[PDB]
Design a protein around this ligand. Structure first.
Ligand SMILES: [Cl-]
Ligand SMILES: [Cl-]
Ligand SMILES: [Cl-]
Ligand SMILES: [Cl-]
Ligand SMILES: [Cl-]
Ligand SMILES: [Cl-]
Ligand SMILES: [Cl-]
Ligand code: NA
Ligand SMILES: [Rh+3]
Length: 129
């Protein structure tokens, strides 16, 4: 599923991401935009052989099981495929664990490089939230 911007903002809010670990909703929407272009089916292979899955490009190296990432963990206790669902519950719940890991949203390189410090509120402008 390719979410609309405000559609995703609303779903993220309902799932408790607005201000989670201090990160306003616009931060989450901005991260999703640059990670996946709001596409739940987005996948991308990393150089180390791990893969990133879903709207927030969660990595098989630590967070989910895809059966093909040697030495990796599954800290969200989910198959990586669960992160590609039209229902964002699994992605959100796993994102909550990631952002709590110590480095906040810097865990998402695209958030650090493209969202951090910018006017992220623009990402939820006009949405009925
Ligand atoms: Cl957009
Ligand atoms: Cl915001
Ligand atoms: Cl594996
Ligand atoms: Cl594990
Ligand atoms: Cl599994
Ligand atoms: Cl959803
Ligand atoms: Cl933080
Ligand atoms: Na894994
Ligand atoms: Rh939902």
């Amino acid at each position: 599923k390719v979410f609309g911007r405000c559609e995703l903002a609303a779903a993220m809010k309902r799932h408790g991401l607005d201000n989670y670990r201090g990160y306003s909703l616009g931060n989450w929407v901005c991260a999703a935009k640059f990670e996946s272009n709001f596409n739940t089916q987005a996948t991308n292979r990393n150089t180390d052989g791990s893969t990133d899955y879903g709207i927030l490009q969660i990595n098989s190296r630590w967070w989910c099981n895809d059966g093909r990432t040697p030495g990796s963990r599954n800290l969200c206790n989910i198959p990586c495929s669960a992160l590609l669902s039209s229902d964002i519950t699994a992605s959100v719940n796993c994102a909550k664990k990631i952002v709590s890991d110590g480095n906040g949203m810097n865990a998402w390189v695209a958030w650090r490089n493209r969202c951090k410090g910018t006017d992220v509120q623009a990402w939820i402008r006009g949405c009925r939230l």
